[PDB]
Amino acid sequence: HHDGFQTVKATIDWEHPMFKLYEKAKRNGKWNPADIDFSQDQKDFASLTSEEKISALPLVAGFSAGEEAATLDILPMAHALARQGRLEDVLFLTTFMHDEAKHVEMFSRWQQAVGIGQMDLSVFHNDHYKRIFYEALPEAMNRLYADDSPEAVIRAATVYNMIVEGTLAESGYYTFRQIYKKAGLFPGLLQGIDYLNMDEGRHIQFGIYTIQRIVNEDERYYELFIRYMDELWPHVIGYVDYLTELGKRQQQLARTYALEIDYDLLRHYVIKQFNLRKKQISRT
Amino acid sequence: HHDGFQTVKATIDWEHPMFKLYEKAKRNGKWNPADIDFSQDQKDFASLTSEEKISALPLVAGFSAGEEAATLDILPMAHALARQGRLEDVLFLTTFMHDEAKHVEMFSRWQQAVGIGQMDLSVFHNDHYKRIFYEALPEAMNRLYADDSPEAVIRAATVYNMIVEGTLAESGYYTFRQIYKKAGLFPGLLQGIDYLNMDEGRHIQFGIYTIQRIVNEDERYYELFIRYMDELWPHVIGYVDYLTELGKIDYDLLRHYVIKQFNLRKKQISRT
Ligand SMILES: CCCCCCCCCCCCCCCC(=O)O
Ligand SMILES: CCCCCCCCCCCCCCCC(=O)O
Ligand SMILES: [Fe+2]
Ligand SMILES: [Fe+2]
Ligand SMILES: [Fe+2]
Ligand SMILES: [Fe+2]
Ligand SMILES: [Mn+2]
Ligand SMILES: [Mn+2]
């Protein structure tokens, strides 16, 4: 039952940080995946050798499943904050969810356009990937339906916003630019990634706001955050190692396009992102 | 756990009706309540007598609470269809939810601008209004977390889309235009109502799609739909009666518009 309604008893809290982020989301999140021209991506992909064609698919496989999970799995956080009466957070999260729908859509449109929609890309999800995206993420989010304690909310935000978005997704944007933008390939995909990277800046800010406000109540939760970050790292790097090992086995795309793909620089960027995210939460 | 992912094994079902509605929602649903200029609404409201001022508040109180409930209470429907693997429905519902967020925002910005944001408007929710929006609506939606049976989904869409949106909300837009558009009052609010009414056409389409696809499996669900509609009618008309009595502009014309919408919504679902 509803006890009453905030915008009947009072108004929206116009100065709330999540209302301000909601306003930025509406202003800055206008792109439509349906407007991206993928006709050159189709030609690029068809001109690749079958072995150059493979080079790109593990990353796309990781993002398609990642964004699809993100779309489904943010719903429990919106429910939990709604139940807590956090109306401005909920408003913001409608833009978060609609962003993720556009991200799932964008990657699926690319796969359709380049002619791999019919290919099952699950083969590029190794055990570490599955531990994060098939298991740990939905588990942490679904918990919130029955347990919205500070510990549960910190864990959900850590897995979703700080690891999946703030570490893996961020490193995936960078990787995509380091390879395909340098090669001059897949302009529509890169246009999509750029829009998506802009959206995700807000998503990470929501995760920081959420973790920090809970840490602010009791510094003890800061140790929980660091611990949960560290619990997931073995699967973060276990998946990065797998993609790295795949990239190192099929190198014709790098050879062909004179790319010196520095996977050790990429691996270093993942480590950088992970420690950067930790640093954006403070004990006090 | 996730078993797999549709956009990894295959793609979005591009021809799905809810994917098509999602595409339409992106193309058509671009407005921003923050762009509406409410400066003349403030002057219009200050120009009213105290008695005229209060006459305007019950309808706004009903909408502000209604849109806030809608924002919160669509989440279980999104969850239940997500759990059923109905990805295109879920994509569409992200536009549904962000629409309701704009609707809540719009009416709250209007209250702030005209100077009643500090006034507790709960006094204009009578028992019938509370039965629907404080109780029946969240009850039917939340049920879906533990019971996503056809009967539960039909009931949820009936209360939310066919009664709250298709009957009360539709009749409220009409009412605002019959009274204030004709009076030349609150142009910012009426601009908002117009955008909101465009959005809500899609929301009603989702409810029709959802109810009819379940009805298509079994005509016993058609009778359930009609029963749930009739079960809520006394509170619908109990609230309309309350608003009409406060108003005392053809109220019998408005009251008949409500009945018209109610019967219209029933006729948009077919037994067959
Ligand atoms: C060799 C370096 C590898 C770099 C890591 C590649 C990461 C692939 C990204 C897939 C998951 C991203 C999903 C984000 C969803 C969301 O917005 O929450
Ligand atoms: C005098 C005739 C009265 C006509 C009916 C007035 C009803 C007031 C509006 C309140 C309901 C708002 C519902 C929100 C709709 C949504 O789910 O998006
Ligand atoms: Fe995100
Ligand atoms: Fe391993
Ligand atoms: Fe609606
Ligand atoms: Fe009554
Ligand atoms: Mn995303
Ligand atoms: Mn609405």
Residue numbers in the entry:
A (entry chain A): 3 to 286
B (entry chain B): 3 to 250, 263 to 286
Authors' own words:
The heterodinuclear Mn/Fe cofactor is found in the R2 subunits of subclass Ic ribonucleotide reductases (denoted as R2c) as well as a related group of proteins known as R2-like ligand-binding oxidases (R2lox). Although the physiological function of R2lox proteins is not known, the cofactor catalyzes formation of a tyrosine–valine ether cross-link in the protein scaffold. Two proteins from this group have been characterized to date, homologs from Mycobacterium tuberculosis and Geobacillus kaustophilus. Both contain the ether cross-link, and both co-purify from heterologous expression hosts with a long-chain fatty acid ligand bound in a hydrophobic channel leading from the protein surface to the active site, hence the name ligand-binding oxidase. The two metal ions are bound next to each other in octahedral geometry by two histidines and four glutamates, with the manganese ion occupying the N-terminal metal-binding site 1.
The cross-linking valine, which is completely conserved across the R2lox group, was changed to an alanine, isoleucine or leucine (V72A/I/L). Crystal structures were obtained of all three R2lox point mutants in the non-activated reduced and the oxidized resting state by soaking apo-protein crystals with MnII and FeII under anoxic or aerobic conditions, respectively. The V72A/L mutations were found to have little effect on the global structures of the reduced and oxidized resting states, but an ether cross-link was not formed in the oxidized state. Since the outward shift of E202 in the oxidized state reduces the steric strain on the active site, the effect is much more pronounced in the reduced state structures, but is also observed in the oxidized state.
